[PDB]
């Protein structure tokens, strides 16, 4: 039902990189930091649209 | 090659192309990039507007009917027949001159008679 | 002559465009990647007609964007050798005649015009035959046959088609029609 | 767009001829001391190395320009030294005239089916390879050439023979020519190659006999300026030097023997080009005695560092980085809507101040050096999409390293906390994983750039995520020395801290407002604080644990447990109840590394945010 | 699939460490310290 | 940053971080691999176009990002009449 | 594994098959990498040192994860 650590790190990195190259961020408005922490807070709210397709 | 792989292709008349080109043109009305047609595409449209001897639908119908008329009339040849609209035996000759099979005067008249319909009248 | 292509490819949808339906978006990218180009195999890519279906998105380590397996429709144009075509004279020059037969032009040499001695009228914009008073100028409609194709670059304006009207059943429509009797 | 696989094999003549940019025919180099450009071996549409851009259609100046291959039409076929033993093992295992593997139908059927059961193990496939070899080598009646008596082969270094028959009881040895051998390998069908060590598509046997020699690009043959010519080039010069002589002698008159001598000479030269350190092959030396080192000798033959100082006043995952080091090490941050203001203030502060920057990278990619000029007109309409290299900020992801790097715990992700002076500050409990002390030990500091890398380190390598060692089921990051002594004094029978001490010092941790500090257990002697209660002010309200302390020994072992099947009159068997320290004293048993009983429990049950807190507040 | 395999597709170990519990996450070798989990009943 | 220093990132599992430190910040070279061939294709300035050896201009080749060392290795193996057919795998 | 106890290096585990590249940089091994490569038959991968020597993300760690995200909207 959950993610593995490696998958978490991977997803976070991906979203952060998406945010760097542009791409508006979902619900965040009052912040003041890097794309990494933006993706990190986004993850703390479980709104990161990145899904891990597991081979099974 | 266009893209990774080509899965399907079809030979298309000028009339059908006229409709598709007009769509592409009308699609712009595209707002965010507007997306104008490049020059030769605009030229192709103009030529298509002028040389489309049939309406989009009657051109398709004629193309299908010519294909079912003989085995030696494939989709490309039928499309060419619809673009040219041969009137008599001379016109049939030059169309099939460099083709696989040369139609006898009899079967040539069969094609002409089929194409004797659909002719724009006006 | 035209052709309809149904092709499955892979499109990379930029992150800056996640605010647009994948069909529309991938359509844009594809249009900006293929339209205006002569693919030697298929020919002049006129336009991406549409995007039928698109697969799931996949992110690759390094890029961050989204790669999808899309399927789309395009309209192309290939001028095969010895193909019979009809067109309109769109340019007059002292050495030849360019005839619009589609998205490109087809050059016809002055020695491949008519069964008669042809000279280029300098003062005007036309070709004139000595014996037969047949004249060809700007805006004239003709029927010719491709005799050679020079496919250099993918740039449509660098490739050149050669044609001739020096064959039975070719040339201006008035000639064709008047000769039948 | 990345490499799935690589499939090795053997190059066909066709490939070498097609992948060539031009046919090399003139055996010469540069020549000489002025104007280094010829028409055979040097840049004749082949490759660029001097500050002159002309090349093979691709133009591509000397700067950035992948070398192009060439070819050499060998006047005669030449056995490849690398396959010599393999070619031999092939020749005397198969039939001449035939093309069969000298095996019965049965043998092939059951062999291939024993060859698929081994199709991955390189070591165990050779046993059966050589076994097959010897089983065919003993026969002389193949099932695909009416049998014609096979004259056994001889070899080496590159010569072959066949002890044929023509007389009767004789055993004369017919010599073997590369042309013969190659044309004899071209008969062996694709069906038989799998039963050997070859491929029908990837590695045909005939290709083992070179008909065309591929010439390395200019880029792979750079000239070592003082010019010290490249060895490969020289040996190649000799090879073409004989090749042309051979072809010129074949086209003219043919005394046969002459062609044989020249052929074998060419063979020598190619043999040397492939491997100069070969066996049975006189090393082609340069005019000095120093051997040429060819192909077989060719594929053969943002950080910082400083002293460390302790700091039990920073978070356990934090690292103290000298602000000077922070002003040298920079991070690539693309300007977006949330940091637009920050980065603009940073770049405006210039390479000076403290929160400044050194470089700026616009979307085109051109790097801008903020030194010269001024931070004025540079820091203008930046627009989104640019990139600022700002100085290290408090909180940035950073790798801390101490060599030697035994276990993985030697490299851990930390959080920069910029401080003056000139050393790295390491919180004390993170000393066991690094195996660092202080006397003079120095450590490394890494600053990752791509967001993916930073995140990955911050999510997976952060200090707090590795309190427990993978070697044994226990915590590695914990109390060292004073932490142990302090835990003891704090949790002693006679531990009574006056208000002055408790109140003022709990600020080294936190957690009070209402129902935490309450209520002063002892007002007997005086209103005072029992140490057990003060310690109790940290553990969560549900961990009940009990384990004997270090002193639970000798005749002081005792016991007197009592299960639940409240007062307090115990000492040894440490009893903690819902945060309340009932009995016990803190020591090496209680805290510290290696152990496995308390710090262990709070990290399994509550792993990240809590574990770090209990650790951080306890030291102080 | 919870299996330790060599890079050439060779099952070196059907389920890692027999039980599949990471030694960094096990209670001193034990695959879930049972005596501890039971006590946790309050 | 050598052997054990590689093995630490491996142990944690930080792949991106490895590449990040040992390649991406040095000499990253991009070469074009043919799909059905396996042999590195060929660009061309002056004309601006690709074309692999065996397959002629017509065939769509794919880009591959790699350390220059391996390109040099492919070249060396190829000069030794060995074919390192590159089996691509899709994006 | 393999049916018999073998040493952990060179004449055993490190000595066996992996991919050519895991023995290609096997320290200047004439009689090895020269021998292994002189036999051109096949080649796989999905190893570890092969991918780092080539410039690829190692298939361990995160490398064994694949992302996916529908882009509307
Ligand atoms: Mg020490
Ligand atoms: Mg020390
Ligand atoms: Zn070049
Ligand atoms: Zn035989
Ligand atoms: Zn190719």
């Amino acid at each position: 039902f959950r993610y593995t650590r490696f998958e978490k790190a991977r997803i976070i990195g991906a979203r952060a990189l998406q945010i760097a190259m542009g791409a508006p961020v979902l619900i965040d408005v009052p912040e003041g930091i890097t794309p990494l922490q933006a993706a990190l807070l986004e993850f703390e709210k479980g709104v990161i649209p990145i899904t891990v397709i597991r081979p099974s | 090659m266009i893209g990774r792989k080509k899965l399907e292709e079809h030979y298309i008349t000028i009339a059908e192309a006229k409709e598709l080109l007009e769509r592409r043109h009308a699609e712009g009305l595209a707002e965010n990039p507007e997306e104008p047609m490049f020059y030769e595409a605009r030229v192709s449209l103009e030529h298509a507007e002028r040389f489309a001897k049939l309406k989009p639908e009657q051109a398709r119908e004629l193309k299908e009917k010519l294909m079912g008329l003989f085995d030696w009339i494939n989709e490309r040849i039928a499309a060419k027949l619809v673009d040219i609209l041969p009137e008599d035996y001379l016109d049939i000759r030059v169309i099939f001159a460099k083709e696989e099979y040369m139609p006898t005067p009899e079967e040539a008249e069969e094609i002409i008679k089929v194409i004797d319909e659909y002719r724009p009248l006006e | 002559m035209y052709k309809l292509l149904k092709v499955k490819d892979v499109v990379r949808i930029p992150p800056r465009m996640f605010t647009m339906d994948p069909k529309e978006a991938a359509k844009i990218v594809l249009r900006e990647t293929y339209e205006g180009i002569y693919d030697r195999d298929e020919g002049v890519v006129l336009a991406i007609l549409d995007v039928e279906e698109i697969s799931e998105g996949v992110i690759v380590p390094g890029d961050g964007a989204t790669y999808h397996e899309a399927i789309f429709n395009v309209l192309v144009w290939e001028p095969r050798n010895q193909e019979v075509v009809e067109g309109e004279v769109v340019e007059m020059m002292p050495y030849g005649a360019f005839i619009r037969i589609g998205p490109m032009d087809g050059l016809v040499h002055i020695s491949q015009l008519m069964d008669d001695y042809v000279v280029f009228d300098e003062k005007n914009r036309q070709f004139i035959g000595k014996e037969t008073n047949r004249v060809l100028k700007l805006g004239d409609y003709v029927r010719a046959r491709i005799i050679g194709v020079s496919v250099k670059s993918r740039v449509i304006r660098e490739n050149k088609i050669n044609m001739t009207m020096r064959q039975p059943g070719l040339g201006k429509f008035e000639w064709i029609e008047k000769e039948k009797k | 767009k990345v490499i799935g696989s690589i499939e090795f094999g053997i190059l066909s003549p066709q490939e070498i001829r097609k992948m060539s940019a031009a046919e090399i025919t003139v055996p010469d180099t540069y020549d000489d001391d002025g104007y280094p450009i010829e028409g055979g071996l040097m840049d004749k549409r082949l490759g660029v190395i001097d500050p002159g851009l002309r090349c093979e259609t691709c133009g591509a100046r000397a700067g950035e320009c992948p070398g192009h291959f060439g070819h050499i039409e060998l006047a005669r076929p030449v056995i490849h030294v690398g396959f010599a033993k393999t070619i031999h093992r092939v020749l005397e295992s198969t039939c001449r005239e035939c093309g069969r593997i000298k095996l019965t139908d049965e043998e092939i059927e059951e062999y291939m089916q024993k060859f698929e059961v081994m199709g991955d193990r390189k070591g165990a496939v050779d046993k059966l390879i050589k076994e097959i070899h010897k089983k065919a080598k003993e026969r002389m009646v193949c099932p695909h050439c009416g049998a014609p008596q096979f004259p056994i082969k001889f070899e080496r270094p590159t010569i072959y023979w066949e002890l044929r028959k023509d007389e009767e009881g004789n055993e004369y040895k017919h010599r073997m020519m590369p042309s013969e051998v190659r044309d004899r390998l071209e008969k062996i069908p694709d069906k038989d190659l799998p039963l050997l060590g070859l491929h029908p598509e990837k590695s045909r046997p005939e290709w083992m006999v070179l008909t065309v020699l591929p010439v390395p690009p200019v880029t792979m043959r750079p000239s070592i300026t003082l010019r010290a010519e490249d060895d490969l080039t020289h040996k190649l010069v000799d090879i073409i030097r004989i090749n042309n002589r051979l072809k010129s002698n074949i086209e003219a008159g043919a005394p046969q023997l002459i062609i044989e001598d020249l052929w074998d000479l060419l063979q020598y030269h190619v043999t040397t080009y492939i491997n100069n350190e070969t066996s049975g092959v006189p090393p082609a030396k340069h005019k000095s005695g120093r051997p040429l080192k060819t192909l077989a000798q060719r594929l053969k033959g943002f950080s910082a560092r400083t002293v460390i100082s302790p700091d039990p006043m920073i978070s356990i995952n934090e690292v103290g980085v000298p602000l000077a080091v922070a002003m040298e090490l920079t991070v690539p941050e693309k300007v977006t809507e949330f940091n637009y203001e920050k980065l603009k203030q940073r770049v405006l502060n210039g390479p000076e101040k403290y929160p400044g920057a050194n470089y700026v990278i616009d979307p085109e990619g051109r790097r801008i050096r903020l030194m010269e000029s001024n931070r004025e007109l540079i820091a203008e309409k930046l627009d989104i999409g640019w990139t600022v290299e700002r100085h290290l900020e408090d909180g940035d992801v950073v790798l801390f390293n101490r060599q030697p790097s035994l276990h993985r715990m030697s490299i851990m992700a930390h959080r920069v906390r910029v401080m003056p002076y000139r050393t790295f500050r390491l919180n004390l409990p993170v000393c066991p994983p690094y195996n660092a002390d202080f006397d003079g030990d120095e450590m490394n500091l890494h600053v990752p750039q791509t967001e993916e890398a930073q995140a990955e380190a911050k999510i997976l390598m952060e200090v707090q995520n590795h309190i427990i060692s993978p070697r044994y089921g226990g915590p590695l990051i914990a109390g060292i020395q004073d932490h142990i002594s302090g835990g003891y004094l704090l949790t002693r029978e006679g531990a009574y801290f006056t208000r002055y001490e408790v109140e003022q010092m709990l600020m080294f941790a936190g957690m009070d407002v209402n129902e935490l500090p309450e209520p002063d257990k002892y007002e007997n002697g005086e209103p005072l604080w029992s140490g057990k209660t003060i310690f109790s002010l940290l553990l969560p309200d549900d961990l009940t644990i009990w384990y004997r302390n270090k002193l639970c020994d000798e005749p002081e072992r005792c016991e007197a447990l009592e299960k639940l099947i409240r007062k307090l009159a115990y000492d040894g068997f440490v009893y903690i109840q819902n945060g309340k320290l009932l009995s016990g004293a803190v020591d090496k048993k209680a805290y510290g590394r290696e152990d496995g009983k308390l710090l262990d429990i709070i990290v399994r049950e509550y792993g990240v945010e809590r574990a770090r807190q209990f650790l951080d507040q306890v030291t102080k | 699939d919870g299996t330790v395999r060599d890079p050439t597709g060779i099952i070196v170990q059907f389920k890692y460490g027999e039980d599949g519990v990471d030694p960094m996450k096990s209670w001193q070798g034990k695959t879930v310290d049972v005596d501890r989990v039971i006590v946790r009943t309050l | 940053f050598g052997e054990m220093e590689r093995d630490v990132l491996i142990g944690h599992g930080a792949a991106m971080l490895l590449i990040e430190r040992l390649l991406e910040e040095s000499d990253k070279t991009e070469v074009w691999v043919c799909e059905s061939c396996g042999h590195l294709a060929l660009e061309d300035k002056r004309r601006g176009k690709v074309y692999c050896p065996v397959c002629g201009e017509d065939e769509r080749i794919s880009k591959v990002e790699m350390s220059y060392a391996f390109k040099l290795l492919l070249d060396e193996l190829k000069a030794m009449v060995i074919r390192p057919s590159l089996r691509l795998k899709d994006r | 594994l393999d049916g018999v106890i073998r040493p952990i290096g060179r004449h055993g585990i490190v000595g066996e098959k992996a991919s050519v590249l895991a023995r290609a940089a096997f320290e200047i091994t004439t009689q090895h990498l020269f021998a292994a490569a002189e036999r051109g038959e096949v080649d796989p991968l999905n190893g570890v040192v092969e991918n780092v020597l080539i410039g690829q993300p190692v298939p361990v760690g995160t490398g064994i994860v694949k992302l996916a995200m529908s882009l509307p909207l």
Side-chain angles (χ1 to χ4, degrees), chain D residues 1 4-11 15 57-58 69 201-202 214 302 405 408 449-450 456 460 466, chain F residues 5 8 11-12 15 20-21 25 39 44-47 63-64 75 78-79 81-85 87 91:
Chain D
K1 238 187 265 178
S5 348
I6 302 104
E7 299 179 359
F8 282 150
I10 303 171
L11 273 165
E15 310 180 71
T57 316
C58 55
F69 253 13
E201 257 61 28
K202 299 177 208 224
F302 286 90
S405 310
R408 69 175 178 183
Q449 310 291 63
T450 61
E456 197 143 312
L460 231 120
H466 285 300
Chain F
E5 323 294 326
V8 51
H12 288 261
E20 168 70 24
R21 171 55 33 184
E25 287 170 320
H39 313 333
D44 190 79
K45 276 226 178 192
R46 151 194 183 184
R47 296 153 80 176
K63 250 165 179 154
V64 173
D75 283 343
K78 208 83 91 173
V81 92
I82 300 181
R83 58 182 254 175
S85 283
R87 177 83 117 204
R91 187 93 193 192

Side-chain angles (χ1 to χ4, degrees), chain D residues 308 402 435-442:
Chain D
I308 56 180
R402 190 208 127 73
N435 195 32
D437 40 42
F438 286 115
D439 56 24
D441 287 15
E442 325 178 27

Side-chain angles (χ1 to χ4, degrees), chain C residues 9-159:
Chain C
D9 196 327
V10 171
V11 193
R12 176 194 165 275
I13 309 179
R16 318 95 180 179
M17 204 165 50
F18 92 89
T19 69
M20 187 188 311
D21 188 85
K23 286 169 177 154
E24 293 179 15
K27 196 127 99 186
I28 301 189
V29 185
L30 287 164
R31 285 182 175 177
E32 294 169 310
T33 315
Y34 286 101
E35 290 179 354
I37 279 140
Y38 191 114
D39 197 272
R40 286 195 166 190
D41 295 340
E42 329 292 349
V44 173
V45 178
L46 282 113
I48 309 280
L49 298 174
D50 78 293
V51 177
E52 261 185 42
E53 295 184 30
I54 185 187
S55 84
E56 264 304 309
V58 185
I59 321 257
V60 195
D63 192 5
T66 70
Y67 294 83
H68 294 70
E69 194 167 55
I71 294 183
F72 62 93
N73 283 315
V74 232
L75 183 73
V76 297
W77 190 81
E78 201 200 297
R80 65 146 49 192
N81 196 13
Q82 64 180 20
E83 188 195 318
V84 195
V85 295
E86 301 169 332
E88 166 193 355
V89 187
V90 291
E91 178 122 304
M92 216 59 206
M93 348 205 50
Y95 63 88
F98 283 81
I99 306 160
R100 175 188 302 190
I101 58 179
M104 308 180 61
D105 291 346
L107 172 67
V108 173
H109 195 266
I110 109 179
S111 63
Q112 301 284 10
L113 299 178
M114 72 194 81
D115 282 25
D116 193 20
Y117 187 83
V118 196
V119 232
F120 176 73
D121 192 6
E122 246 295 308
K123 191 147 86 63
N124 306 327
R125 65 272 80 176
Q126 64 200 242
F127 288 113
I128 311 177
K130 198 235 176 178
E131 274 71 32
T132 64
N133 199 28
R134 306 183 222 204
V135 182
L136 193 73
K137 61 192 304 178
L138 208 288
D140 298 23
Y141 297 91
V142 304
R143 182 199 298 191
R145 179 198 306 281
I146 300 177
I147 223 66
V149 186
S150 179
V151 189
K152 297 205 179 302
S153 348
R154 331 276 316 292
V155 173
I156 316 172
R157 271 332 199 192
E158 310 206 37
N159 301 334

Side-chain angles (χ1 to χ4, degrees), chain G residues 37-65:
Chain G
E38 84 191 332
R39 322 296 167 137
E41 294 81 49
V42 268
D43 187 3
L45 53 114
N46 295 309
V48 126
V49 116
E50 306 90 302
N51 292 277
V52 86
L53 200 75
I54 203 169
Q56 231 73 87
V58 297
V60 253
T62 56
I64 196 43
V65 79

Side-chain angles (χ1 to χ4, degrees), chain A residues 6 10 14 18 49 51-53, chain G residues 61-62 65-70:
Chain A
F6 298 63
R10 174 83 202 112
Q18 295 175 332
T51 300
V52 167
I53 285 186
Chain G
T62 56
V65 79
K66 224 182 168 194
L67 304 175
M69 162 190 117
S70 52

Side-chain angles (χ1 to χ4, degrees), chain D residues 149-219:
Chain D
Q149 274 272 339
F150 291 136
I152 331 285
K153 260 55 64 187
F154 209 23
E155 205 251 349
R156 103 208 292 287
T158 59
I159 302 93
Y160 301 82
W161 279 296
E162 53 171 45
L163 300 117
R164 232 192 285 197
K165 20 237 80 283
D166 174 34
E167 183 249 13
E168 258 316 306
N170 189 17
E171 98 300 70
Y172 69 91
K173 318 181 68 181
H174 179 253
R175 211 260 171 157
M176 212 89 116
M177 235 57 68
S179 166
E180 291 185 280
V181 183
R182 182 158 213 275
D183 258 312
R184 283 169 194 171
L185 296 175
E186 298 173 46
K187 311 213 192 82
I188 298 164
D190 304 79
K191 301 92 223 180
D192 282 15
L193 292 173
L195 282 150
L196 285 73
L198 292 178
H199 236 297
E201 257 61 28
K202 299 177 208 224
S203 60
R204 284 290 303 186
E206 53 260 30
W207 304 338
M208 291 189 294
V209 188
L210 308 164
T211 74
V212 182
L213 190 97
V215 170
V218 175
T219 63

